[PDB]
Design a protein around this ligand. Sequence first.
Ligand SMILES: *[C@@H]1O[C@H](CO)[C@@H](O)[C@H](O)[C@H]1NC(C)=O
Lengths: 15, 91
Amino acid sequence: VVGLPGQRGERGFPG
Amino acid sequence: DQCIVDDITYNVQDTFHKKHEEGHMLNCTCFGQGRGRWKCDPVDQCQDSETGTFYQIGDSWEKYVHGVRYQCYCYGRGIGEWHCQPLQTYP
Ligand SMILES: *[C@@H]1O[C@H](CO)[C@@H](O)[C@H](O)[C@H]1NC(C)=O
């Protein structure tokens, strides 16, 4: 039931 | 604006695929919005419960377990559905 993760990013993503 | 992802440059509105580090497949869009913003969703796909390996819809594979060889297929069908059959000789 637990979905797979997606991903995101951008210039200046904190992470 | 443009997106940059795994050293690859995208135009705004581009769509592309990307493998997540943990192994599964994503489909992504380049949004830009001034900071090359992008996002990726996991696509419908299958995960082999033993090896942890991911397969895409239409992929087939063989499992060798319990001293038995099987052939498996990924149907997807919105639920990452897959099935296996024992290896079988035919005429
Ligand atoms: C991934 O694909 C689905 C369509 O199958 C689409 O609705 C979704 O917007 C896509 N996601 C991204 C981040 O491109």
